[PDB]
Swiss-Prot record:
GN (gene name): HSPA8
Family affiliation: Belongs to the heat shock protein 70 family.
Enzyme class, first EC level, given as a word: hydrolase
Quaternary organization: Component of the chaperone-assisted selective autophagy (CASA) complex consisting of BAG3, HSPA8/HSC70, HSPB8 and STUB1/CHIP. Identified in a IGF2BP1-dependent mRNP granule complex containing untranslated mRNAs. Interacts with PACRG. Interacts with HSPH1/HSP105. Interacts with IRAK1BP1 and BAG1. Interacts with DNAJC7. Interacts with DNAJB12 (via J domain). Interacts with DNAJB14 (via J domain). Interacts (via C-terminus) with the E3 ligase STUB1 forming a 210 kDa complex of one STUB1 and two HSPA8 molecules.
Name listed for the protein in its UniProt record: Heat shock cognate 71 kDa protein
Shown residues within the full chain: 3 to 384 of 650
Modified residues (Phosphoserine): 151, 327, 360
Induction summary: Constitutively synthesized.
Length: 382
């Protein structure tokens, strides 16, 4: 038999973890990455999932699906869906009220319910675990945002079943992050924890109260359309202007030039979280012109100043709704790949008057980490 695993099914990135020998192991994929893009792509000859999928989006924009988490368990008539679809390069049709993604696979036109797309990503995570564990993975704990209603939770459970996973339990993402740090241990009296989650495309702030081992989501806030992608876009717009300056050519119209530039920016951004400047080396970006440049962390922070700063507004609201003061929150844990940005860390710490931030576990692996632990206890492995 095999161990149960914990899976973070994210909007942009997903992650798998497994508790074994009192330690949690975050499993890397085929490309060696510890998190894999929640991307699925359909071509003439195959269906690509994960890195392979994202690594060809600029070439196959209408048949490469992403953001399935924004659709899952929702209706077509949903104002959310209606708004979101205005920015998706892939087709989304109404099917008796339910939204469906329409793609072209092997010449034939095919459609999928959002839960089917997510099951594909889930299958990828499962095989990643299996490759590592050297055994079949059946049981799993999958995470979901705290605000997900019954339909969304149902659809997520369904995605699991059709993926061949026996979903032991669906737990909230903030709660999984708290468990990763062991903030669920009984210490007598209440503990207020603030989960600051800034991922690839969403921002969630959750204030949890934990007494006797029971979690209570006191308040939540954030922005469904604020994430690392927005930071990348600011770099893109910055570089489009620079190319136009140096070569008097506007590459905006060329969707491929822009997507290749975005991929380069996202990578330079990650480097910036550990270095003061990074170089952008793109061969033959537009026409036959190579675009060789670099950005400094200062210029980067400067391009996103208003965005970074605005991050504190949802924090303030969460506090007031929860009826607490800065001084009353006991622990602050960082979740999401974007929390690795030094400026975001400074900004939050300054706001909480120097309080220490919980960030020893990679923020983008925190949710999976907690789910893995939770899976183990539910399986008697712990
Ligand atoms: N070193 C880093 N510095 C800055 N951003 C990073 C770094 N490493 C990863 N990221 C970004 O973090 C995002 C990935 O976040 P992650 O939390 O893994 O996603 P997720 O849970 O799918 N997020 P969300 O889209 O909000 O649901 C992307 O915008 C990456 O560029
Ligand atoms: Mg997330």
């Amino acid at each position: 038999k095999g161990p149960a695993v914990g899976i973070d099914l994210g909007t942009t990135y997903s992650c798998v973890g497994v508790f074994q020998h009192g330690k949690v192991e975050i499993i890397a994929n085929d490309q060696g990455n510890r998190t894999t893009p929640s991307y699925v792509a359909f071509t003439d000859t195959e269906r690509l999932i994960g890195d392979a999928a994202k690594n060809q989006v600029a070439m196959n924009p209408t048949n490469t699906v992403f953001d399935a988490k924004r659709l899952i368990g929702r209706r077509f008539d949903d104002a959310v869906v209606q708004s979101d679809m205005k920015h998706w390069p892939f087709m989304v049709v109404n099917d008796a009220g339910r939204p469906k993604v329409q793609v072209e696979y092997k010449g034939e036109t095919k459609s999928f319910y959002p839960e089917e797309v997510s099951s594909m990503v889930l299958t990828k995570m499962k095989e990643i675990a299996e490759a590592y564990l050297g055994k079949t993975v059946t049981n799993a704990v999958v995470t979901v945002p705290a605000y997900f209603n019954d339909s969304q939770r149902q659809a997520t459970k369904d995605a699991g079943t059709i993926a061949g996973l026996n979903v032991l339990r669906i737990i909230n993402e903030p709660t999984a992050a708290a468990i990763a740090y062991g903030l669920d241990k009984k210490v007598g009296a209440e503990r207020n924890v603030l989960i600051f989650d800034l991922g690839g495309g969403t921002f969630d702030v959750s204030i949890l109260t934990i007494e006797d081992g029971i979690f209570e989501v006191k308040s939540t806030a954030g922005d469904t359309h604020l994430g690392g992608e927005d930071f990348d876009n600011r770099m893109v717009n910055h570089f489009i202007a620079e190319f136009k300056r140096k070569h008097k050519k506007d590459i905006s119209e060329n969707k491929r030039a822009v997507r290749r530039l975005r991929t380069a920016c996202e990578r330079a951004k990650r480097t910036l979280s550990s270095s003061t400047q990074a170089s952008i080396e793109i061969d033959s970006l537009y026409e036959g012109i190579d675009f060789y440049t670099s950005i400094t962390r200062a210029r980067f922070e400067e391009l996103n100043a208003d965005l970074f700063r605005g991050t504190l507004d949802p924090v303030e609201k969460a506090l007031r709704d929860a009826k607490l003061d800065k001084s009353q929150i006991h622990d602050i844990v960082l979740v999401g790949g974007s929390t690795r940005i030094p400026k975001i860390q400074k900004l939050l710490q300054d706001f909480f008057n120097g309080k220490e931030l919980n960030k020893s576990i990679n923020p983008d692996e925190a949710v999976a980490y907690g789910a893995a632990v939770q899976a183990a206890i539910l399986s008697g492995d712990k």
